[PDB]
Amino acid sequence: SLDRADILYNIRQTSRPDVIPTQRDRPVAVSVSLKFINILEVNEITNEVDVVFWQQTTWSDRTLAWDSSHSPDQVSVPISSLWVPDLAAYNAISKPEVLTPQLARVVSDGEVLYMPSIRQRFSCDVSGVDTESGATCRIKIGSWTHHSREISVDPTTENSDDSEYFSQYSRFEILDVTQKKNSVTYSCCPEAYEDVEVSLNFRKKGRS
Amino acid sequence: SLDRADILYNIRQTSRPDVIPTQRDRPVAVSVSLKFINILEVNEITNEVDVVFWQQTTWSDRTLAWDSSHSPDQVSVPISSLWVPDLAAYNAISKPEVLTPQLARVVSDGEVLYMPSIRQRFSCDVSGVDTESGATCRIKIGSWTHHSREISVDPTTENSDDSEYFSQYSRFEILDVTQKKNSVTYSCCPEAYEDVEVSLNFRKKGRS
Amino acid sequence: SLDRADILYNIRQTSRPDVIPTQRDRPVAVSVSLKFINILEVNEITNEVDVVFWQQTTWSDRTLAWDSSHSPDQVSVPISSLWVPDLAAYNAISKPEVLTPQLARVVSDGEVLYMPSIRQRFSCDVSGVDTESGATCRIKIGSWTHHSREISVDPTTENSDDSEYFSQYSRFEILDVTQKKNSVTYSCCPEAYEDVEVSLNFRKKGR
Amino acid sequence: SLDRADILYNIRQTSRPDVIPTQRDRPVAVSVSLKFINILEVNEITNEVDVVFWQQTTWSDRTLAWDSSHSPDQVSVPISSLWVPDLAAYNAISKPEVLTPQLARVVSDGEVLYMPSIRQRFSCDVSGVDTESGATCRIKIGSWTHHSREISVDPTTENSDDSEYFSQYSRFEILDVTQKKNSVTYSCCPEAYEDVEVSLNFRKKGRS
Amino acid sequence: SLDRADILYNIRQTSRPDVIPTQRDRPVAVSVSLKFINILEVNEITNEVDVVFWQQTTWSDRTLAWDSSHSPDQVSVPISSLWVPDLAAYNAISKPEVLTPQLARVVSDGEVLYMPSIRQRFSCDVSGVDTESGATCRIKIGSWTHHSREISVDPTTENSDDSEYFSQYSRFEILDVTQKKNSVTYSCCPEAYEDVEVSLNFRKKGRSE
């Protein structure tokens, strides 16, 4: 039997945080799912939104796996000990302000879950925010330097209510969230980069 | 007679900052109590408030214990040398600004006390703040990555006064403070994550 | 049958982050290209703009090279493990805010592509911004400490399109972007500092 | 012989940054003295000020001492290489913005002098700011984790001018400064933390 | 038989970044010159100014010196790998925001040039900014912890053009910059601290008559 200290030690022995854990020459399947918590500061003039969301990020790194027979099957681990996907919001206009402890969960099979609460500002369509049908702000997230042969990005469609963790005290409300998968090619390169496009359909709440 | 240096060096060689100090496979029992020192930058339209609180945080790591018959029975220790609970306010919308030195006290029996002064912005019900009944702003605080089997969160056992350390110079006054245990399951997982929900009943001082 | 872990391990052994990778006494040929993504704030009175651009930067560090005949020919690498050109915008009035992960792409032949997305404020000519012919804001980017014999700077004057990646949600639009080679030289010293002058010809949308 | 390089070397290898340098079992005598440099922003509605002060801070760490018969008797040392008292402003509402290089001065006897320029925001009484009487903003500075038996806090006895280095360009002027020894105690515990109360008596300057 | 990597490796082992390289009993002669590039927010009610400037900082460190017979006689070196004067603006009300790569130039005789673009806010006399004769904002720069006998600050005696690099797109224009020298003794300590006073005389462009 190993304790949590032994597991963490074994992870720091086999984890190479600067090396993508591809198996075969297959891409690492990264899942990304936003859970919007708040919409803080909207500007229809400048098409800018300030949003708080939980970024559900899962992937597998088999280098972290251990025997969990008579031992715990999960640990919390600082992300600086692990390879993490180099996700970027393509239409972000501020750095991500990470509000939560920078720890990820690692399961004994090597499945990793990182879920930071992030506050960030985006350039996106705010038109119609004060109308009844709302604005639809599209947020694009994928790897910054890993193309499709290295990272696949995919949404996990089991939306635990679009507006489930969303603050009831926002001035805004969510009408709909659709998370569609997408790709882009840049003439720099022959390569394509996978992204999740997250469409946030929201509006200012009416008054009685 | 061990001196403070000896006490510290023992802690350094034993403490594991990235390893939760569970006993057997029981949860680490963490205690959290917010002393409110100030309410600032209130906004009833956006439902947002800055708060300054001392976040009293107690837990035990019995491996750190020493005999304090002919030696000091407490030392100040930088938190970077200790495991510290990965606490987070679930309805924070800014990262905590830690106003005080990041030092904890380790007692010779293995009890640890970290009490940082934190300024932080929250999304919560600010309605009625200028009325007599006041507003009730609920702050949730618990482990981000450790479920109920790994970390338990409990309010401090005693009900000390609400405005005891509260700036007399604030534009607001506290009417009542209420700390209640709580526990949520999330879409990610079947396990539950414990929190203390602090209910801050406060209002603007009457013009007197 | 080398792998990504080998490639990185070898980079760690050969790479000198603080040492300019000049061959002989020939300058490190650095290529710079700004791709404008957004223009966020413009001030017609103060002559200041807040912009978002991808700064596509390429150079060669031959010490990084490896045989990729039976292994990957490219890896993503943190810039802390590489030497990076000490580029600065001469007319910037804020620190560069790097929005993206700080990883460069390294090719097996030693070629490096670093492409940060950067938000930054600049002091430049905003006159004309509210007219059809628009304003012309020039950004000067070159090495801060390495002269012409040490670093050379050149645009990637390809068939590069202006608004290809530019946000349609900006209140401004790009009319044209020309990136021309230049050299500043500062009164004191017989040392010329090469730069790219990026002329951003833009206007506010609407009548 | 024994040049500055040797002195820095010995400091670096003798210093214990995380261990208080208590001579025998008596508190570390810390001296604190704010010299006000500016009052930037003030708000009489919110009872908040933004001030700039040099924090003259002296104490002794005897282990650092060296023989300066044939060598220098004073060196500048980065505080990161030194034990430094864990001072906090109890009524601070912002992190101390240190404006100067983080170097202290070490004397061959072991006396350390650290004097950072700090810009910081405080919650204090601002009422009267635009009268002849003026306002009196009290600032409390003591150790955050070390009680009376570990750290003692005294104002420096120097009878210096109160406006001496204060900016003539500030919108405000200082009528008087009083720096007074005090302690604070909490209902949790019997231990007392010593502090200086600094009483800033200032007002808005007239055009006349 | 020596390249740039060799020069850096040798600097690393000779260089003591936390040791001022005083020679014998002399102070280290630091010379300081501000090349004003921009003047941003100005507030006359509050007497505060936001300024961008290149802080031309030069000094000698013979520990760094090497033989440049068959090697480069100058390298760019990160400032963390060498000793740097602990300069401070006395009347600054914000941390210096360094806009450029933090690299210094080292010549093989051990002469060091370090010249960050700095953006920083100051408390100084802004009254007059919207007048013909303009405002004069004084910026005092000197060592924070080294006294006259350890560091000396003297203004670059070069007869510089004041607005040589000053943005033509600024709202302000520079009338004059003058750099004097001072030696102040405070209340903590018996020794004197050298400073350069930089008087920046400037005003708004495009005023009437």
Ligand SMILES: CN/C(=N\[N+](=O)[O-])NC[C@@H]1CCOC1
């Ligand atoms: C976002 N655009 C992009 N390329 N491009 O536009 O030519 N990404 C791939 C780059 C490879 C290194 O980091 C980014």
Ligand SMILES: CN/C(=N\[N+](=O)[O-])NC[C@@H]1CCOC1
């Ligand atoms: C200042 N307040 C205090 N107790 N209290 O407020 O009840 N003790 C010192 C704390 C010990 C750990 O960090 C600070």
Ligand SMILES: CN/C(=N\[N+](=O)[O-])NC[C@@H]1CCOC1
């Ligand atoms: C708060 N949300 C949560 N799950 N969820 O929202 O689906 N779990 C906690 C996460 C476990 C790993 O990092 C944090």
Ligand SMILES: CN/C(=N\[N+](=O)[O-])NC[C@@H]1CCOC1
């Ligand atoms: C600049 N001011 C000064 N004294 N004073 O103002 O009373 N001495 C230098 C101090 C020595 C260590 O930190 C700074």
Ligand SMILES: CN/C(=N\[N+](=O)[O-])NC[C@@H]1CCOC1
């Ligand atoms: C770019 N500017 C320059 N001269 N100048 O501005 O007067 N030389 C390079 C300097 C070498 C050290 O830091 C910058």
